[PDB]
Short mmCIF file of N, CA and C in Angstrom, two decimals:
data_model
loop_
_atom_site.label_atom_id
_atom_site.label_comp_id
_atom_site.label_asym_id
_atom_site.label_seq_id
_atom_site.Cartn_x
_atom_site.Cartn_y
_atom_site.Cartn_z
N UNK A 2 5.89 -29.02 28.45
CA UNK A 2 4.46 -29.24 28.48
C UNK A 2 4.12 -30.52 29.25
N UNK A 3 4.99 -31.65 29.10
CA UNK A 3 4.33 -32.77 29.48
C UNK A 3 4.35 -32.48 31.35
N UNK A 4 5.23 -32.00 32.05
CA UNK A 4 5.30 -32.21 33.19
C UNK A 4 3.94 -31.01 33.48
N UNK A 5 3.47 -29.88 33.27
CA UNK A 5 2.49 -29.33 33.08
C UNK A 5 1.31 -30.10 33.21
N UNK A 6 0.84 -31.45 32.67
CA UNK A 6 -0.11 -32.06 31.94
C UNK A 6 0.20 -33.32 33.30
N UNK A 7 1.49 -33.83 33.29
CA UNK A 7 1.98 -35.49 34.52
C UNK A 7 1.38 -34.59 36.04
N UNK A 8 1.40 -33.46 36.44
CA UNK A 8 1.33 -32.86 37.48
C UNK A 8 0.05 -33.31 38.24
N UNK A 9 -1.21 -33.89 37.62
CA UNK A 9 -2.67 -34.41 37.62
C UNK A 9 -2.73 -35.68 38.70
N UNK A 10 -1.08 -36.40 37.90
CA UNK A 10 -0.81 -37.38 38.94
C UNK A 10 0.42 -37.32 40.14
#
């Protein structure tokens, strides 16, 4: 999930 969500930056 988190790399899902870090992808923004």
């Amino acid at each position: 999930l988190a790399a899902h969500l870090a992808q923004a930056l």
